[PDB]
Symmetry: C2
Subunit: 459 residues, 2 copies
């Protein structure tokens, strides 16, 4: 019940400041998992508790909630709001679905592919909420096929969100934790490098996921799917001037992100804010002044400020833990794990994170786990990325339960899925994702991020 | 037109870093006044421009957008959302209106008083939006009386918002500018001290405003007003458990604010966040688990995150100006004003700010003006509060034009008001407010804030 979770851990107070910080983290973790209070409200607990426990005064805690990574996430959110408002993502989805065809194998392949590619830029929740209605329309016009198609949308959304830093919350958590715990790693992880590392990983995950879904689960079926796609495309209207401007702004954002990383004042957040500002200036109609692509009302009602506060609370947790000496204590405690082969450590941690994300939020899960893993990596003399990147990717492997991530809840809202089918498919999804992420980290992740050597920024 | 304001100042680039910061500030000021892009989007321009002009890199700029004052404002906003959601503010308004009576003089007095007291805690926009419908209902059940009653609601809302730090945006701007420009002034300005200084000032403004409105502008009229108030009170329902809990949480917030100021880790933001968190825990119904007073959905859709970003942009402007050496340059330039008597300087500045707020947002106006006035005060060896407090109070004196502040727009949305009547009444409002604020700053503001001496935190 809520009462036992609300009251009992809060009254655990009877020590050292690192013990108080560990208590704050454990209480926040319990509130993350149990959802007794909202995620953003839980993320505000550092402001409440660190001054009370004298870890950081209110000024230090409050200045941790908006940062470079948080601003980059906000800019990406604004761009995503612009894309969703002018209905460009559905246009891309329908165009690519028409291009790939409608035969059931390639139909599922195209659905998973477009969901993954759109989830790189649009949020996984929004991508799933847009894509599932098309699946429902096609199915209405086999039970195994229905459940496979419902699962594939959320599975591909979760996989594709990992490909870009702004694609999913755990990636932004990883970037913020890298800047907090390892400040000397100046933009080593960025949009270009993270893309170069995760997009092939995302493609491998998508291919193996599609293969497994074909394993576990035709003319007029193709004709019905084509009819549905064409009818959905006709009501979309002609490619409008606003959609063209949004696409141009998005392409400019992508080009500036990938070109910035082929003193350094300009970062990825600067590019995101630049394009977001342009979205409030670029007209939505031909002048023949026409309204801009975005106004502050829709940006206000559509931006998930709760996730921004969640990221800020994660950064405040990192700051309080680093200042209070908790991270040093954890590193000293679990350095006797320097006897294990790093590969086995990565496999075990990825499996544990993938399992743990089935019960709680991906962003909260990676927020809780990344400081511990970074302390381990610093203690055992291993590259922090070599641990954090696979664990950050595994934080998005919410495949077993509908309550694991909002895309699973969205797909489970429809009646084609039961809990049992989802858990049987999701265990193999978790194993496949862990294997693919392991292979990527051990094969081309090493070249991109220099995982073979202990970096200087890890001390 | 928008095009000339969009393009021409942006292309002014052909110098010294302080010149570039001054250019950024001037461009932001033009965008504040002209409203070419939204206020929050304009507040994000430091992130775009300071890295481009090499004043501050993206990490320094982005960390300025959430701070102690911004968190306190957010907590107060959450508490206000809780009050508005459970319809407690309307209950207080109707109860006090029934208590004061319905005779036209005391009717207007009670309306102005309750609007001022509610605007201390609820936002001026929300207070006006709640209060004007009661006025309309009473009037429906003399043209001069109608226009007087419509003006008085927004006038009292603007006056009452000054009484508390969270009452209006300019006060939060003043607190943030005090922490930015004068870091050594540890919580010299706080909720308790600002209340002790401004609540008598607010009362004097309210009394003189009511007197002037009676100057420029009965049984069954009283009976109709009483009938309207009673009927509005009956549909409100009995005092519910949720309203009692919200009132208790509000009283706890007020008590903790006033008792904290009869190392220092706990601040007013800590109290605001504590009460806001309690609003997500305290039940809204008798357990007989019942839903809490707040959930994150309504808090998300009701909190003005745009104003939070506006405050953050103001803090980033202050940081970039202080770092770039612009403030030193302005102080050196306008120290030849050390020949004027401080009282004349305060009168002139208060008049200029009160006039300038008629054309642009109060928050933007005080954001633009406070750094210049602080630089003046530092240069001429005068207490910065002795200049900033009257100017911060005058920033809320939006009385002449409907476009000056959202309360004026709300009251002007109804047809009882024309622009001419509003400007004639508002010029005398501005003069009266400037005089009252001058008297308060020179009589009891000196005792509270030690305005007679140049403080050490002003260097």
């Amino acid at each position: 019940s809520f009462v036992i979770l609300f009251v009992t851990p809060l009254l655990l107070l009877p020590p050292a400041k690192f013990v108080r910080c560990a208590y704050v983290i454990i209480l926040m973790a319990i509130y993350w998992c149990t959802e007794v209070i909202p995620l953003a409200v839980t993320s505000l607990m550092p402001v409440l508790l660190f001054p009370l426990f004298q870890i950081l005064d209110s000024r230090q805690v409050c200045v941790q909630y908006m940062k470079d990574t948080n601003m980059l996430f906000l800019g990406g959110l604004i761009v995503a709001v612009a894309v969703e408002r002018w209905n460009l993502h559905k246009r891309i989805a329908l165009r690519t679905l028409l291009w790939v065809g409608a035969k059931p194998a390639r139909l599922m392949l195209g659905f998973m592919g477009v969901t993954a590619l759109l989830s790189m830029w649009i949020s996984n929740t929004a991508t799933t909420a847009m894509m599932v209605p098309i699946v429902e329309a096609i199915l209405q016009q086999r039970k195994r096929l229905c459940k496979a198609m419902t699962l594939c949308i959320c599975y591909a959304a979760s996989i594709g969100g990992t490909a870009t830093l702004t694609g999913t919350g755990p990636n932004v958590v990883l970037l913020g934790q890298m800047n907090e715990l390892f400040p000397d790693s100046k933009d080593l992880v960025n949009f270009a490098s993270w893309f170069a590392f995760a997009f092939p990983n995302m493609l491998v995950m998508l291919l193996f996921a599609w293969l497994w879904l074909q394993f576990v689960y035709s003319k007029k079926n193709e004709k019905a799917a084509l009819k549905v796609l064409q009818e959905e495309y006709r009501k979309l209207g002609p490619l409008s001037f606003a959609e063209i401007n949004v696409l141009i702004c998005f392409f400019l954002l992508v080009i500036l992100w990938f070109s910035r990383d082929p003193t350094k004042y300009v970062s990825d957040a600067t590019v995101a804010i630049f394009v977001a500002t342009l979205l409030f200036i670029v007209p939505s109609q031909k002048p023949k002044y026409p309204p801009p692509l975005l106004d502050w009302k829709v940006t206000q009602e559509k931006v998930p400020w709760g996730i921004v506060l969640l990221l800020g609370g994660g950064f405040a947790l990192a700051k309080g833990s680093e200042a209070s000496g908790l991270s040093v204590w954890m590193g000293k405690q679990m350095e006797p794990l320097h006897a294990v082969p790093p590969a086995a450590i990565t496999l075990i941690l990825s499996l544990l994170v993938a399992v743990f994300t089935e019960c709680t939020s991906n962003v909260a899960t990676t927020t809780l786990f990344l400081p511990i893993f970074a302390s381990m990596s610093r203690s055992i003399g291993l590259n922090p990325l070599y641990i954090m990147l696979p664990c950050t990717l595994s934080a998005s492997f919410a495949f077993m339960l509908p309550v694991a991530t909002p895309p699973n809840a969205i797909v489970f809202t429809y009646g084609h899925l039961k809990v049992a089918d989802m858990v049987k498919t999701g265990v193999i999804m978790n194993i496949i994702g862990v294997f693919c992420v392991f292979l990527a980290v051990n094969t081309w992740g090493r070249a991109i991020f220099d995982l073979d050597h202990f970096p200087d920024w890890a001390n």
